[PDB]
């Protein structure tokens, strides 16, 4: 009982405080030193902003778990749910956009000269915000408060047939936030590594080979972190949508761990991109 509650609260608080602190520090560093002259810095800034917004929802989820009830009213219910979905999409598709940007930078340098301008980067980021709003707003409208068996529950409602719209939403989220992003990122980075293997600046001396190895490691680490962080929660959601599994303390802790592990992407993202970037090391 109290042990499982305490541990889950601790997980949420860790992936909340760490996420906000890291992403805010990234935001500060970007605003004060780097400056928005490079396309990459605009992507990193928007990514950090979205990721901080996503991490800002975690205390509300922890509180909802702790009392088993939502005390914040329908206003906050609506806003929080919409923000959570909006952040999920903006962060994931910002990572996708950055992967496409890097693939273009390496494989198509002549076209990259015209495409990769900071103006275009801002435009693309804004476009990502509009497409994410295309889902965040419907979620806000559908979100409402319903009286649960216990007291009250901030959840999502669906038109009849409820199962149809619920499964549609779950499938859409799974496809567009997991399958398509994973495929785009993996393909773009694989192609980027393959192209980089055949560059005269990384196919000669042992120091140049070491540089190629560290670049390849960077790519593999980013992909692995994304997959490891996001796959389990999606698998769990699919299983619980397809199969009625009996509830247990173990099931509750595993579920909340999977959610926290999803947010662990939001916690590792600023460290991996902002802190482990050679450009930031100056």
């Amino acid at each position: 009982s109290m042990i499982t509650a305490i541990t889950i609260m601790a997980l949420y608080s860790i992936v909340c405080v760490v996420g906000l602190f890291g992403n805010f520090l990234v935001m500060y560093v970007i605003v004060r030193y780097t400056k928005m002259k490079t396309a990459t810095n605009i992507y990193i800034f928007n990514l950090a902003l979205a990721d901080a917004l996503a991490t800002s929802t975690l205390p509300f989820q922890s509180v909802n778990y702790l009392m088993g009830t939502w005390p914040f009213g329908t206003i906050l219910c609506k806003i929080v749910i919409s923000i959570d979905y909006y952040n999920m999409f903006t962060s994931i598709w910002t990572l996708c956009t950055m992967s496409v940007d890097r693939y273009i930078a390496v494989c198509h340098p002549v076209k990259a000269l015209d495409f990769r301008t900071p103006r275009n980067a801002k435009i693309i980021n804004v476009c990502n915000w509009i497409l994410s709003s295309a889902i965040g707003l419907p979620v806000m409208f559908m979100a409402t408060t319903k009286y649960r068996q216990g007291s009250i529950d901030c959840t999502l409602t669906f038109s009849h047939p409820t199962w149809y719209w619920e499964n549609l939403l779950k499938i859409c989220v799974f496809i567009f936030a997991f399958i398509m992003p994973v495929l785009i990122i993996t393909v773009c980075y694989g192609l980027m590594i393959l192209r980089l293997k055949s560059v005269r600046m990384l196919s000669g001396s042992k120091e140049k080979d070491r540089n190629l190895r560290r670049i390849t490691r960077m790519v593999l680490v980013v992909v692995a972190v994304f997959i490891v962080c996001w796959t389990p929660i999606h698998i769990y959601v699919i299983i619980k949508a397809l199969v009625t599994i009996p509830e247990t303390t173990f099931q509750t802790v595993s579920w909340h761990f999977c959610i926290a592990l999803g947010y662990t992407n939001s916690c590792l993202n600023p460290v991996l991109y902002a802190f482990l970037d050679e450009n930031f090391k100056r």
Partner: peptide
């Protein structure tokens, strides 16, 4: 994601 029901 997965929170709130």
């Amino acid at each position: 994601y997965x929170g709130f029901x």
